[PDB]
Design a protein around this ligand. Structure first.
Ligand SMILES: O=S(=O)(NCCC(F)(F)F)c1ccccc1
Ligand SMILES: O=S(=O)(NCCC(F)(F)F)c1ccccc1
Lengths: 188, 188
């Protein structure tokens, strides 16, 4: 209600400047409420970012679950990486501010860490199933391969979304990651 | 002289706490000099970190040049990745503080960005030479493949050195990266 208005204002202002340059008064004004009324819904602007990040992370996670509960192996991995490309790619300002807040908020670091562990455990489970069915060779420990591939995707997606130098162009980043996943999972 | 003493004190204190919890007075005391004498050598504690990072980055870069100016393809890539594993792995506190300072220092962000561009251009040149000699297939654009692999290495090395959750164990991180480089460069 007022909560959704605060969250929407925060995501809007984060497209223009960092959390550090946004004040509680900014979030209040944008949401059409007073400062004290803002503090009824959130303890701080930092808690507003944590909620936005939590919604984006849960949206990716729910889309991955939907995929899992339902093509060739290259398209299977592409469809799964694409959940993260589209979800985070649709919320670049929250992605960029959320990643930066990992350095200064234990809650943001622990949220990111919890979901990364889940997504790595899922990637490793799929590699093991591919190994069990005889489609993938038993090369690296599946969990170690999964970890490296998930960290590559974290760094490479986020560098592309932020336009970092260096970065893969956003229009080339899906094909780039899929090639590296498929060759490293199926290759000897 | 006093400069090396300041740099050595800073690298020592960075093994115990972040730059934010180290004062100019701390660096002065450790180096056996006054605060005003410290400011003769460096404008700030931030400039001390930038110099330490610059020395570590140049040490990796010089070791890579030595390798380039001088085994099978898997060992060739392993020896090159190992420059970064050993160099950064030998200076974990400077690595960790330098990476964090990318968020708050334009000079640290631009130093890291300059060397990443150089190391990616070198990786792409080697992939192209492997493609020219008929040892690697023409799959992804070499520069885009190089970018993704260099970013994977940045994120995965630094997560392993910092003991992050998640991370590849430090004792498994070289073999993990080499497998992904070799399969993604030589694989179709
Ligand atoms: O590695 S993933 O593409 N996403 C995790 C990393 C990040 F969130 F993008 F940062 C991935 C994980 C699980 C299944 C398919 C793809
Ligand atoms: O990708 S690399 O291992 N190092 C760049 C990344 C970082 F510095 F480690 F962060 C690499 C680059 C060039 C040749 C061999 C290996």
């Amino acid at each position: 209600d007022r909560e959704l208005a605060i969250l929407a204002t925060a995501e809007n202002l984060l497209e223009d400047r960092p959390l550090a340059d946004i004040s509680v008064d900014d979030l209040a004004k944008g949401a059409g409420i007073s400062r004290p009324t803002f503090y009824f819904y959130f303890p701080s602007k930092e808690a507003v970012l944590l909620t936005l990040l939590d919604r984006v992370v849960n949206q990716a996670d729910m889309a991955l679950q939907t995929l899992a509960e339902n093509t060739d192996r290259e398209n299977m991995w592409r469809t799964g990486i694409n959940v993260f490309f589209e979800t985070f790619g649709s919320h670049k300002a929250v992605t960029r501010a959320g990643q930066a807040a990992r350095a200064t908020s234990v809650e943001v670091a622990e949220l990111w860490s919890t979901f990364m562990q889940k997504w790595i455990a899922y990637t490793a489970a799929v590699i093991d199933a591919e190994r069990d069915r005889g489609a993938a060779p038993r090369t690296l420990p599946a969990h170690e391969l999964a970890t490296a591939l998930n960290l590559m995707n974290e760094r490479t997606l986020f560098a592309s979304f932020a336009g970092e130098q260096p970065s893969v162009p956003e229009a080339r980043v899906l094909d780039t990651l899929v090639h590296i996943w498929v060759t490293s999972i199926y290759g000897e």
